[PDB]
Write a protein that binds this ligand. Structure first.
Ligand SMILES: *[SH](=O)(O)c1cccc(CNCCCn2c(Sc3cc4c(cc3I)OCO4)nc3c(N)ncnc32)c1
Length: 208
């Protein structure tokens, strides 16, 4: 069963801006997604200090970057806190609305798209390089969900019946046809070294 939802107008506008604005520095999407994973790993780690059973779903805290040229996907996998259905449908949109407003105001004052993470909406930078984004996520006391959007004003959520993850999030970037450089080992390594070199969890770049 697949549920279809409308983005808030402000978030649809942000996604359109990211898709339509001419901006060549697209590589910053990876820093934003790795930062989000690092934050999620920080969160499960700190919560586990007062409730160690929150790691029953997996003790290892890490990030995997998995390119697949057959599928034309780049996947960012973490074993962080994960997201609930309530996050996916309601709560993330609440903070994304205020963050988008501040980001738009900063852009009008001369800021550039690379500062998007300062406004809490860095996830949507995925649409600099992806025509579709699928997010598989599992939070401790909730089901495994698949979120998906090709923009256009809507997203879907369904219960995921794929390989169980234990706990964490996979962001699957279905790359635009002209953005396949982000499947190349040398290019991904270059970007991680430039923008994500002090992340406090192992980042494993898979090879194909
Ligand atoms: S906690 O609950 O005290 C707490 C403290 C501070 C902040 C938060 C809220 N964190 C939300 C993180 C969401 N998120 C992201 S970004 C993101 C992902 C997706 C959408 C929108 C956004 I904005 O729509 C679909 O997916 N990336 C995350 C990862 N990798 N893991 C967990 N949470 C993530 C809570």
């Amino acid at each position: 069963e697949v549920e279809t939802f409308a983005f808030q107008a402000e978030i649809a506008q942000l996604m359109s801006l990211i898709i339509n604005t001419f901006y060549s520095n697209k590589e910053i999407f990876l820093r934003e997604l790795i930062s989000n994973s690092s934050d999620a790993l920080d969160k499960i780690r700190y919560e586990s200090l007062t409730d160690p059973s929150k790691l029953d779903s997996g003790k290892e805290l890490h990030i995997n970057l998995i390119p697949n040229k057959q599928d034309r996907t780049l996947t960012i996998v973490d074993t962080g806190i994960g997201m609930t259905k309530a996050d996916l449908i309601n709560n993330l949109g609440t903070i994304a609305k205020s963050g988008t407003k501040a980001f738009m105001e900063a852009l009008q004052a001369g800021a550039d798209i690379s500062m998007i993470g300062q406004f809490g909406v860095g996830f949507y930078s995925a649409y600099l390089v992806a025509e579709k984004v699928t997010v598989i996520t599992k939070h401790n006391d909730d089901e495994q969900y698949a979120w998906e959007s090709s923009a256009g004003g809507s997203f879907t959520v369904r219960t995921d019946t794929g390989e169980p993850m234990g706990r964490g999030t996979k962001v699957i970037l279905h790359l635009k046809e002209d953005q396949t450089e982000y499947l190349e080992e040398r290019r991904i390594k270059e970007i991680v070294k430039k923008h994500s070199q002090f992340i406090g969890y192992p980042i494993t770049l898979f090879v194909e």
